[PDB]
Amino acid sequence: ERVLIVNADDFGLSKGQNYGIIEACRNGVVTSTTALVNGAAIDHAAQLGRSTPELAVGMHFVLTLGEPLSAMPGLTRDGRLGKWIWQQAEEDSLPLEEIAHELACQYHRFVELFGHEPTHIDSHHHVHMFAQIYPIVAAFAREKGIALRIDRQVAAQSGLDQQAARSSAGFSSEFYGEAVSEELFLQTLDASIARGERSLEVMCHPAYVDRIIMGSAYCYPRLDELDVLTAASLKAAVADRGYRLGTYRDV
Ligand SMILES: [Zn+2]
């Protein structure tokens, strides 16, 4: 009747995150994950994905963290990606062709790593929701016949096409922080329901802690997210609300 997609971002970031996502899926409500095809532990993530058919995998398009697959002289500094892209976007100085080519390269490498088309595309730091990147990424997803994470409030603030590609009816980025709880997760569900949404994607970041995660400002809350997502109470509350646990393939 309703479909709930619970998507863990940043598959491939680190081995500890990889094991947190697998655990949140095998013993929790995580149904989906999106992978950094350039991540330090991407080959490790791909071995787990191949062994865990019950986990759907999409592509975490990334323009701000690793090294790109293709040469992007209009974007990289000392060969690396980084967070200057926000200012570069507002100065209308994005190398949009380089970006489109890197999107195609990350897609090609995704299929090599995992042996299937990604169920959908989202992005590290939500860069695919930038006004000038969104129509490129959505046209790509439409072209490939796959879905897109669509933050509908961001799209509406930026005049973007809500139908640019197939997606869930709504998306929530509100399940995060130090105060993560079962309550918080369920509040995003009940808020989606009141908006009249028949499907919802809920972002999350479960992980076991390793030295890579310890280098992030968001570290130990990932353990709390893992705890919430694997509690027996949560599956009951999801079912209680008429949700079927699902993936972007259902859209
Ligand atoms: Zn991310």
Residue numbers in the entry: 1 to 251
Sentences from the study reporting this entry:
The chitobiose (chb) operon is involved in the synthesis of chitooligosaccharide and is comprised of a BCARFG gene cluster. ChbG encodes a chitooligosaccharide deacetylase (CDA) which catalyzes the removal of one acetyl group from N,N’-diacetylchitobiose. It is considered a novel type of CDA due to its lack of sequence homology. ChbG is a unique COD that is conserved in bacteria to mammalian genomes.
Thereafter, the purified protein was crystallized, and the 1.83 Å crystal structure was solved using the molecular replacement phasing method and refined to Rwork = 20.24 % and Rfree = 25.02 %. Two molecules (A and B) were found in the crystallographic asymmetric unit. The kpChbG crystal structure showed the typical fold of the YdjC family and contained an unbalanced α/β barrel fold consisting of eleven α-helices (α1–α11) and seven β-sheets (β1–β7). An acetate molecule and metal ion were found in the putative active site of kpChbG. Clear metal ion density coordinated by D11, H61, and H125 was detected at the putative active site of kpChbG. The metal ion was identified as Zn2+ by inductively coupled plasma mass spectrometry (ICP-MS)23 with a detected concentration of 701.7 ppb (µg/kg) in around 30 µM of ChbG protein. The acetate ion was coordinated by L13, L66, S217, and R223. Residues D10 and H206 might be responsible for kpChbG deacetylation activity by working as a general base and acid, respectively, since they were also localized at the putative active site. The theoretical molecular weight of monomeric kpChbG, including the C-terminal his-tag is 30.2 kDa. Multi-angle light scattering (MALS) showed that the absolute molecular mass of kpChbG in solution was 64.9 kDa (2.1 % fitting error), which confirmed that kpChbG is a dimer in solution. Since kpChbG had the shortest α3/β3 connecting loop and the α9 helix was localized far from the α3/β3 connecting loop, the tentative active site of kpChbG showed an open conformation with a wider, deeper groove than observed in the other two homologs.
